[PDB]
């Protein structure tokens, strides 16, 4: 009988309870994005901006309901309009992590039919982040 740890065990929404997706696992998700006609995009954040926080609410009256800071991350370049091949996303993932080694990186997808973000899952954790657990999180 094991105890799910409360310490340094931050999650980053969809797929964060799985092992980190390998390059083949990322490529297969990108195939799902492309087949649906969806638009992949990458986003990144530093560890202090990676997870939800309430600090802007100091300025507010009683309207904090469903407000949270750090839902928005920072866009890496532009949404890859007309992306058909998954190797471009994999190259862009490498480029973002190379430019930002201390950053979490997430892959999002937009559906221009329903005009809304439709996916978002993490593709890279920074090694220097102590906030999260390497799947020996018990």
Partner 1 sequence: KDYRLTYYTPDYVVRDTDILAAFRMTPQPGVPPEECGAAVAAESSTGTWTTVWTDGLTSLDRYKGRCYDIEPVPGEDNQYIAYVAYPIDLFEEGSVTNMFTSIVGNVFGFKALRALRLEDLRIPPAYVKTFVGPPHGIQVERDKLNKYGRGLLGCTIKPKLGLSAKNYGRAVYECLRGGLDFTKDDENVNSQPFMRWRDRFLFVAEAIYKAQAETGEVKGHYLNATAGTCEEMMKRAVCAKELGVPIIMHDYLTGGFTANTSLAIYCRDNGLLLHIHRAMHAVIDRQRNHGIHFRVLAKALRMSGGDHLHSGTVVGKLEGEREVTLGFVDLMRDDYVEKDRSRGIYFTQDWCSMPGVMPVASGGIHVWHMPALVEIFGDDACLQFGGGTLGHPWGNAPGAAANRVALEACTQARNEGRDLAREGGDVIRSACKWSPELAAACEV
Partner 2 sequence: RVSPTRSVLPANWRQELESLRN
Smallest distance from its own copies to CB 56, Å = 8
Tell which residue, 30, 51, 47, has the closest CA to residue 39. 30
Under the criterion CB under 8 A, does residue 128 sit at the interface with partner 1? Answer: no
Q: Which of 22, 37, 71, 98 binds partner 1 (CB under 8 A)?
A: 71
CA distance readout (Å), 107 to 5, 9, 13, 37: 27, 21, 12, 15
Smallest distance from partner 2 to CB 31, Å = 5
Under the criterion CB under 8 A, does residue 121 sit at the interface with its own copies? Answer: no
Smallest distance from partner 1 to CB 126, Å = 14
The count of chain residues that interact with its own copies, using the rule CB under 8 A, is: 24
Under the criterion CB under 8 A, does residue 39 sit at the interface with partner 1? Answer: yes
Site for partner 1 in 84-123 (CB under 8 A): 108-110, 112, 114-121
DSSP the chain: ------SS----STTTTSPPPPHHHHHHHHHHHHHTT-EEEEEEEEHHHHS-B-GGGGG-SS--TT--BTSS-EEES---TT---THHHHHHHHHHHHH-TTEEEEEEEEETTTTEEEEEEEEE--TT--SS--S---
Under the criterion CB under 8 A, does residue 23 sit at the interface with partner 2? Answer: yes
Under the criterion CB under 8 A, does residue 74 sit at the interface with partner 1? Answer: yes
In the complex, the residues that contact partner 1 under the rule CB under 8 A are: 1-4, 6, 9-19, 25, 28-29, 31-32, 39, 50-52, 56-57, 59-72, 74-75, 77-79, 81, 108-110, 112, 114-121, 131, 135, 138
């Amino acid at each position: 009988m094991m105890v799910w740890t409360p310490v340094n065990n931050k999650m980053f929404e969809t797929f964060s309870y799985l092992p980190p997706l390998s390059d083949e696992q990322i490529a297969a998700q990108v195939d799902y994005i492309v087949a649906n006609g969806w638009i992949p995009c990458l986003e990144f954040a530093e560890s202090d901006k990676a997870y939800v926080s309430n600090e802007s609410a100091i300025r507010f009256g009683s309207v904090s309901c469903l407000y949270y800071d750090n839902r928005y991350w920072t866009m890496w370049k532009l949404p890859m309009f007309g992306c058909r091949d998954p190797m471009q996303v994999l190259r862009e993932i490498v480029a973002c992590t190379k430019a930002f080694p201390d950053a979490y990186v997430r892959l999002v997808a937009f559906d221009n039919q329903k005009q809304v973000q439709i996916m978002g899952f993490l593709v890279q954790r920074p090694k220097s982040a102590r906030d999260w657990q390497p799947a020996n999180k018990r």
